[PDB]
From a paper:
The envelope with the surface proteins surrounds an icosahedral capsid that is formed by 240 copies of the [name] ([name]). The building block of the capsids are dimers of [name], which consist of an N-terminal alpha-helical assembly domain and a largely unstructured C-terminal domain (CTD). While the ARD is projecting towards the capsid interior, the NTD forms the capsid shell with protruding dimeric spikes that contact the membranous envelope. Instead, most of the mutations with a secretion phenotype map to a hydrophobic pocket in the center of the spikes below the SS-bridge in the rigid part of the assembly domain.
Finally, we wondered whether the binding of TX100 affected binding of peptides at the tips of the spikes of the CLPs. To test this, we chose a minimal peptide binder “[name]”, which binds only to the CD-spikes but not to the AB-spikes in CLPs of wt [name]. To establish whether TX100 affects the binding of “[name]” by forcing Phe-97 into conformation 2, we added an excess of TX100 together with “[name]” to wt [name]-CLPs before vitrification and imaging. The map showed that all pockets were occupied by TX100 and that all Phe-97 had changed their conformation into “conformation 2”. “[name]” bound to the tips of the CD-spikes but not to those of the AB-spikes. Thus, forcing Phe-97 into “conformation 2” was not sufficient to enable the binding of “[name]” to the AB-spikes or abolish binding of “[name]” to the CD-spikes. Furthermore, forcing Phe-97 into “conformation 2” by binding of TX100 has no noticeable effect on binding of the minimal peptide binder “[name]”. Thus, the binding sites at the tips of the spikes and in the hydrophobic pocket have no obvious conformational cross-talk and can be targeted independently or simultaneously.
Residue numbers in the entry:
A (entry chain C), B (entry chain D), C (entry chain B), D (entry chain A): 1 to 143
């Protein structure tokens, strides 16, 4: 079916493509962050939050994709296709994964309205010209 | 992270290992059941329930895995690799997909208590040797 | 008929003639901004605002002009005339279009009074010669 | 963004398609009418009505297209290109322009409900076979 993984939260793919693809941190970095900050609540037997649920399912899915790609590469004999699997994964699905993880982690941490206003402001900013925008890229802080 | 996609909901992979592997319906049947009973909810912008929050993500994961295997079978001129990848997807991950779909659809339709009782009772019925096994296995029913 | 597209909103062309070309984001950027911030209200059957109405009509104009430029590229076998028409369209019409899109988005975003005070101040700043005006221009920003 | 210029007023492209392309008056005639009837308003500094706003924007776009056509006629020596461009502009873009002009002038003048009932009645007419199609095609009146 046609589902938007964010509209149950108050966002949309059209709104997260409003940021450059070179903005979203790497998958490994986001997973490390997620461990460090919410391992005890993702591994928890509680409906702690919809973000927790969705993040769990996403992590399991990335793990299964990784498993599959490693298996294909290990079985295949020639590199041309022993690589193309993991390569295409990190190309097309890595972006979706890290957009979604960024969303969920950032929300759980800072706030949903904050993350949304940040998306909007950062798009407006990265689209405005430098002479007439503030010079420092926007960023999220708990400090 | 070792996440159990069920302990959040009050279960485990073990409790679901009582059911054999050939017990679980086809992914087509289960996707049809979902599109029938819970579509307006899985497309809604609401946290209708953690079951929905999980089912949306799992369906997106399955779609992306399908796209992967298809792009593979297409761009890979080795039909052996095509077949192996796309059918191993089924072999290994479809069983998990349909376990999770079964669990969620059944805890939505009938309930958590009813489903866990069903799991216990079916485990009894199946661990029981045949000679003493009644032919009327437990079936989940609203009627 | 001597129509001023801002006289209805309390502004004028003479008040936006000071804003240079390097001030206005690209057409693509402004369109993405609108699509991300106001799509569910520009595609809506409500009279959400004069700015919404005007944005709708201007986007329709621009879409038809892009259709024209495509038809040109396809039906004009004179590369010179073809490229000259396309460049005229883009440069001139997109400059006017960026001007108007900016006015409307900025108003909807900040306020009519804020946008007009900002225009007055930017005019003061841009009339001042460089030897007596600060180097850092005024700035309209949510941040 | 896919936008319907009539959906905020209470109609739909699929509804004004009931009327043939050779039904709408000349752009000349429609502009004469709009001038004579609402010039003091389309030149006004007031959101007199959404129809007024939309008409302002449309007439501005038509004026820019006229300026384009003159620029072509003077610059481009290639007669085939010049004429093809002017003809495309007038024919197609003016078909759309006079659809819009007609809708807005007619609404402002007679009424939205009147215009929509007229659309459905004209559909009835044009659908009725010529053996039973009265020659008195429906027409909008204030009497
Ligand atoms: C080969 O099957 C063995 C059955 O035992 C399952 C053991 O693993 C636990 C399965 O749990 C899941 C369920 C779903 C999933 C996701 C959400 C990632 C969906 C999937 C598998 C379709 C990608 C991941 C793990
Ligand atoms: C190259 O990526 C472009 C961005 O795509 C935009 C998103 O398109 C709609 C679908 O979005 C998602 C988001 C996440 C996912 C899941 C949860 C399955 C995770 C993933 C991407 C790791 C497979 C699937 C689809
Ligand atoms: C070839 O003509 C097709 C007839 O129109 C079918 C309906 O198309 C819907 C779009 O309608 C309009 C109407 C007006 C316009 C504007 C106001 C932008 C004016 C125009 C046509 C001069 C560009 C754009 C689209
Ligand atoms: C070439 O641009 C120079 C700057 O403009 C100077 C005059 O400013 C007045 C702007 O007038 C318009 C006219 C039309 C428009 C719309 C939005 C209808 C778009 C267009 C140009 C595609 C017709 C916008 C502004």
């Amino acid at each position: 079916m046609d589902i938007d993984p964010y509209k149950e939260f108050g966002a949309t793919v059209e709104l997260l493509s409003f940021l450059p693809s070179d903005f979203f941190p790497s998958v490994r970095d986001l997973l490390d962050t997620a461990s460090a900050l919410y391992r005890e609540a993702l591994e928890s037997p509680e409906h702690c939050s919809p973000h927790h649920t969705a993040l769990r399912q996403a992590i399991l899915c990335w793990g299964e994709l990784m498993t599959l790609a490693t298996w294909v590469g290990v079985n295949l004999e020639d590199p041309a296709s022993r690589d193309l699997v993991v390569s295409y994964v990190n190309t097309n699905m890595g972006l979706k994964f890290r957009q979604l993880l960024w969303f969920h982690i950032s929300c759980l941490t800072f706030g949903r309205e904050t993350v949304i206003e940040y998306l909007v402001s950062f798009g407006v900013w990265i689209r405005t010209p430098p002479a007439y925008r503030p010079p420092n890229a926007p960023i999220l802080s708990t400090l």
